[PDB]
Amino acid sequence: KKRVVIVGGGTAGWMTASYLTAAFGDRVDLTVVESAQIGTIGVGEATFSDIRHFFEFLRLEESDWMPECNATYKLAVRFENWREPGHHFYHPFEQMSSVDGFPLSDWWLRNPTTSRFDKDSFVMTSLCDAGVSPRYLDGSLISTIAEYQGAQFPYAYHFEAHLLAKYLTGYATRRGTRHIVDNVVDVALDERGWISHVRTEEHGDLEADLFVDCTGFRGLLLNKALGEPFVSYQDTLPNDSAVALQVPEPIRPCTTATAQEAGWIWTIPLISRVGTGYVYASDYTTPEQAERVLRDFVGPAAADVPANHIKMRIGRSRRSWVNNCVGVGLSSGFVEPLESTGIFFIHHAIEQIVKYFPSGGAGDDRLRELYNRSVGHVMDGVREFLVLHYRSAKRADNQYWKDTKTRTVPDSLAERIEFWKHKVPDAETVYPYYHGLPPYSYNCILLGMGGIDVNYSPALDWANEKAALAEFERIRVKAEKLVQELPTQNEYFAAMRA
Amino acid sequence: KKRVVIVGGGTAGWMTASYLTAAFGDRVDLTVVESAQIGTIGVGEATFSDIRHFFEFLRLEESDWMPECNATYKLAVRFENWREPGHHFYHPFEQMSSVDGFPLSDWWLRNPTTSRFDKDSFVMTSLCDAGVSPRYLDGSLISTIAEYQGAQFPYAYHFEAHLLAKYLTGYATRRGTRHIVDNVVDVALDERGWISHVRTEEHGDLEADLFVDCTGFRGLLLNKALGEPFVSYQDTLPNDSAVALQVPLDMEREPIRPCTTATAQEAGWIWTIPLISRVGTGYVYASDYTTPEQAERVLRDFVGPAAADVPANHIKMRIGRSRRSWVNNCVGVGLSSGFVEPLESTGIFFIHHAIEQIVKYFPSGGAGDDRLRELYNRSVGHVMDGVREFLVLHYRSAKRADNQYWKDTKTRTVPDSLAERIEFWKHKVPDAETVYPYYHGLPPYSYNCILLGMGGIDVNYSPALDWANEKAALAEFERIRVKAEKLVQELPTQNEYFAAMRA
Ligand SMILES: Cc1cc2nc3c(=O)[nH]c(=O)nc-3n(C[C@H](O)[C@H](O)[C@H](O)COP(=O)(O)OP(=O)(O)OC[C@H]3O[C@@H](n4cnc5c(N)ncnc54)[C@H](O)[C@@H]3O)c2cc1C
Ligand SMILES: Cc1cc2nc3c(=O)[nH]c(=O)nc-3n(C[C@H](O)[C@H](O)[C@H](O)COP(=O)(O)OP(=O)(O)OC[C@H]3O[C@@H](n4cnc5c(N)ncnc54)[C@H](O)[C@@H]3O)c2cc1C
């Protein structure tokens, strides 16, 4: 009978408790200890293509939780002004078809229907441009995380972080999770360096077979108590700061990432407000200037809203599971939210905690090794993907954007980029370990950002293009039909609440 | 405009010609040169989970080609006597379900319904045991190769190799392939080491933008002319020889079993490939442990009196792969590129993958061509290296240890990465995280089937399954059991199915 103690009551702590509750029911003992004094990070409002697995694993329907979390649909990230002023493109959550053995991006490079690869190749692009729900009013859409990401439309969500945490708190406590409001004030280690207990101020000492560090950037257990080194990603991704605001027509079904002079601004539309933030590199602009740029970007509704200034710890713990302690969430690592991967890292982590859950006996070192390899691959792969956003962005208007082309690139990515100049990204040339990103994602960024010239495959000069023309026409016909038929998110969620 | 000259008219040459015809039509000029005097290898009659992509790419229906090739269905490989005498198990061409994030093999280890993982977890196992067709008499089953292998039932075929070659010859020649029957007697190189032409005995010199070496083990262009080194796999897979028979049988006497059988022997294993009118059979063996004469005797004894007066085909195998399969303007396809023993019938898979990749990385003649060749070589090298690991696992996990040969399977070299995987697999059944990470045509369920069937390595179920609710897993095992018992009562035999196809 295993006991798990989760330290931290942010999104990471309550996702962990709820997921473990859904996986193990009352057969594993779960305790969350969270501080009333120490706040959560206060952001984290957009998700990634994994996310439908999480809510379905909890056996929750969208109507169960979306109204309570002011949640909306996220069908894509909309990138504005990365290639050039006034240009936008999408990374949509939608599989890219292959025709006669070549991805649609290859055919598009040879014979584009329009100048917009995303518009020609994915229906979700038109839904985002039109501002419609992916689901009809009758509810219809137009087991592992990986399998859910393989769905035709593996869409995601926007939500209020605090409301999701409160929702998941009720979900987990109603299903047996013990909820302690207290500070962990000491982490006691035994002679072999394992955690023997966490000491609280008022609830005594908590023992467990597994301690989950969900304490955020501070990494109280994994980093402080166990001394696990942290590996910076700042050589390749200099953005180290953010300033965020919550500020009270069709709701656009995507996150917007609008490139700025020293970083980029997110727009996350919720049911009753917008979450917004400027992620920036402090070497290139000040917190004062970044807040000014953000408030100016939002406009007069951002006048007297309080700013949340955040210094980010960018990188990952060398190992996320050390002895009897596993870091989940910001304690394990973090990269800038350009593709909204933080909750994906949490979700992946907790799926892997279940997968590699220890017995207490033989094999546990190998299970921990596999766990650590899996989470390290996800973060290292995503880091490559994020670097590609900056390395392929065409804009070069100032020192910041010029430096994206000269700074460190992971060596393996540099080689992939050289291949991608003549073969569009595919399974052979993408980071080969699971990191949540199928090849179409790389295609969307590479072609959208527009800074690297990509050649279509010479074979397409001799292949008959009839099937490819037919597939582009099918997508165009479907997109124009869907845009006329689907309701807005406003109407959809009004009916859901009703 | 572009010119491709294919040297060799075995399975590799005509698969290449027909595939390029289907990919490019008449927009590329194709020539096959093949020797009337140098025969083909004379074996290669079972295929792999990739294969339905090939025929569909050529826009062929099963009724178009199967009767002409005396073809049958291959739903699995049946491994006999590898674990222990009298034991069999399958590697079936059927996806393995996962329940609540764990593969069915994990749940089976915790709570097996029967002692047979393959019977409990795959419907195709029962079809093979029962000897029935995967398709009803009405034809119903119960764009890239990888996507075809992802089908629920990515089944394969048996066929007469020479009849398939003849069929593909007609297919390609009727669609514009020039067919030269002649010997290539010289391969001339230009100053930069590229092939300038191939000289034939009677048809002059042939130039091309791309030469495809389909000359078999001899590798006339890739290994001889261009000097490309060959990398032996014999450290890990010692089987180096084969003796084969084609045995006519009244295959209408009894149901044709829808699988290849691999029956372990004292110094290797014997294949049985059932066709419409005969059986292809052969003994793959290690020459250090038995002689050709003893191997032929064992094979003839295994087949029985129907092998009387049937001539034996003794084959020395070249086991390994070319260091690079595409060098300058020459790409090796088939045995010229590499070979591993046919334990999982992967040779035609290698050809099929190679020709798909030839189309994928087809050169322009200009910038980028070195990178395209690099990607091609990496892709085919990963396929062969991954399949090598998978084959080694058959021997490394086989329980039988009754003689020196089978004892030596446990002490022989194992690729270091596979040795590490095996240590993980003792506590986590194979999955995407632990299997060879590059495409090699083998999803994780394949590793599970071999690991659990061979029975020589103890595997523990995941500790999490002690706390996970097993209702959904029991429901899935029951669903498979119910479906399998229904299907075996309803499906026709292959005999009936193909009799109606011919009608
Ligand atoms: C600027 C920014 C933008 C982001 N945008 C996104 C996005 O769009 N999408 C996304 O998915 N993710 C996003 N993320 C990531 C996301 O915020 C985190 O992945 C997620 O919120 C989980 O945070 P956490 O629970 O790990 O840490 P926190 O929110 O910091 O929670 C830490 C918890 O530990 C508790 N704690 C700390 N010390 C103690 C102690 N001694 N005793 C008891 N309790 C203690 C605290 O009280 C708190 O409950 C963003 C992050 C940042 C910084
Ligand atoms: C024992 C054994 C069992 C096998 N079993 C299977 C199996 O079950 N499944 C499977 O998929 N694969 C199997 N394989 C592999 C299979 O045989 C090959 O994948 C396939 O037959 C392709 O052979 P090839 O065309 O490359 O060579 P070959 O059949 O040797 O053909 C070579 C061709 O090149 C020609 N040639 C050679 N030199 C010259 C010259 N100078 N001029 C002109 N022409 C020339 C020959 O005449 C011939 O046409 C097996 C192989 C062996 C050895």
Coordinates of C-alpha atoms and ligand atoms in Angstrom, one line a residue, chain B residues 7-14 33-48 74 159 161 182-185 213-218 220 241-244 260 271 273 284 315-317 333-336 338-342 344-351, ligand 2:
Chain B
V7 CA 20.8 -4.2 -63.3
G8 CA 19.2 -7.4 -62.1
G9 CA 16.0 -9.2 -62.8
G10 CA 15.3 -10.9 -59.5
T11 CA 12.6 -9.8 -57.1
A12 CA 14.6 -6.6 -56.4
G13 CA 14.9 -5.5 -60.0
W14 CA 11.3 -6.0 -61.0
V33 CA 19.0 -5.5 -67.7
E34 CA 19.0 -9.1 -66.5
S35 CA 21.1 -12.2 -67.2
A36 CA 19.5 -15.2 -68.7
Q37 CA 22.4 -17.3 -67.5
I38 CA 22.8 -16.0 -64.0
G39 CA 19.7 -17.2 -62.2
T40 CA 17.9 -15.5 -59.4
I41 CA 18.4 -16.6 -55.8
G42 CA 15.3 -18.8 -56.2
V43 CA 13.8 -18.1 -52.7
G44 CA 12.0 -15.3 -51.1
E45 CA 8.3 -16.3 -50.9
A46 CA 6.9 -14.7 -47.8
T47 CA 6.4 -11.0 -47.0
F48 CA 6.0 -8.6 -44.1
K74 CA 0.3 -14.7 -44.3
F159 CA 3.7 -16.3 -53.3
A161 CA 8.9 -15.8 -56.2
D182 CA 21.9 -9.7 -71.3
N183 CA 25.0 -9.8 -69.0
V184 CA 26.6 -6.7 -67.7
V185 CA 30.3 -7.3 -68.3
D213 CA 22.3 -2.5 -58.4
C214 CA 19.8 -5.4 -58.1
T215 CA 22.5 -8.0 -58.9
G216 CA 22.0 -10.0 -55.7
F217 CA 24.7 -11.0 -53.2
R218 CA 27.4 -10.3 -55.8
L220 CA 28.3 -6.0 -59.1
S241 CA 23.8 -20.9 -45.0
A242 CA 20.5 -22.3 -46.3
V243 CA 19.2 -25.3 -48.2
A244 CA 15.9 -24.8 -49.9
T260 CA 4.8 -19.0 -42.4
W271 CA 10.8 -22.4 -42.9
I273 CA 5.7 -21.4 -46.7
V284 CA 18.6 -21.8 -42.4
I315 CA 22.7 -21.0 -50.7
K316 CA 25.6 -19.2 -49.0
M317 CA 24.2 -16.1 -47.5
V333 CA 18.4 -2.7 -53.8
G334 CA 17.8 -6.2 -52.5
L335 CA 20.6 -8.6 -51.5
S336 CA 23.2 -6.2 -52.9
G338 CA 22.2 -6.2 -47.3
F339 CA 20.5 -9.2 -45.9
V340 CA 19.6 -10.9 -42.6
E341 CA 18.3 -14.4 -42.4
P342 CA 14.6 -14.7 -43.4
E344 CA 10.8 -12.6 -40.1
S345 CA 10.7 -12.5 -44.0
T346 CA 12.1 -9.0 -44.2
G347 CA 14.1 -9.1 -47.5
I348 CA 11.3 -7.9 -49.7
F349 CA 10.4 -5.4 -46.9
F350 CA 14.0 -4.0 -47.3
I351 CA 13.4 -3.8 -51.1
Ligands
LIG2 C1 17.7 -18.5 -48.1 C2 17.0 -17.2 -48.3 C3 15.6 -17.1 -47.9 C4 14.9 -15.9 -48.1 N1 13.6 -15.9 -47.7 C5 13.0 -14.7 -47.9 C6 11.6 -14.6 -47.4 O1 10.9 -15.5 -46.9 N2 11.0 -13.4 -47.6 C7 11.6 -12.3 -48.2 O2 11.0 -11.2 -48.3 N3 12.9 -12.4 -48.6 C8 13.5 -13.6 -48.5 N4 14.8 -13.6 -48.8 C9 15.4 -12.5 -49.5 C10 15.0 -12.5 -51.0 O3 15.6 -13.7 -51.6 C11 15.5 -11.2 -51.6 O4 14.9 -10.2 -50.7 C12 14.8 -11.1 -53.0 O5 14.7 -12.4 -53.6 C13 15.6 -10.1 -53.9 O6 16.7 -10.8 -54.4 P1 17.7 -10.0 -55.5 O7 16.7 -9.7 -56.6 O8 18.3 -8.9 -54.8 O9 18.8 -11.1 -55.9 P2 18.7 -12.3 -57.0 O10 17.5 -13.0 -56.9 O11 20.1 -13.0 -56.8 O12 18.7 -11.6 -58.4 C14 19.9 -11.0 -58.9 C15 19.6 -10.7 -60.3 O13 20.8 -10.0 -60.9 C16 21.2 -10.6 -62.1 N5 22.6 -10.4 -62.4 C17 23.7 -10.7 -61.6 N6 24.8 -10.4 -62.2 C18 24.4 -9.9 -63.4 C19 25.2 -9.4 -64.5 N7 26.5 -9.3 -64.5 N8 24.5 -9.0 -65.5 C20 23.2 -9.0 -65.5 N9 22.4 -9.5 -64.6 C21 23.1 -9.9 -63.5 C22 20.7 -12.1 -61.9 O14 20.6 -12.7 -63.2 C23 19.4 -11.9 -61.2 O15 18.4 -11.5 -62.2 C24 15.6 -14.8 -48.7 C25 16.9 -14.9 -49.1 C26 17.6 -16.1 -48.9 C27 19.0 -16.2 -49.4

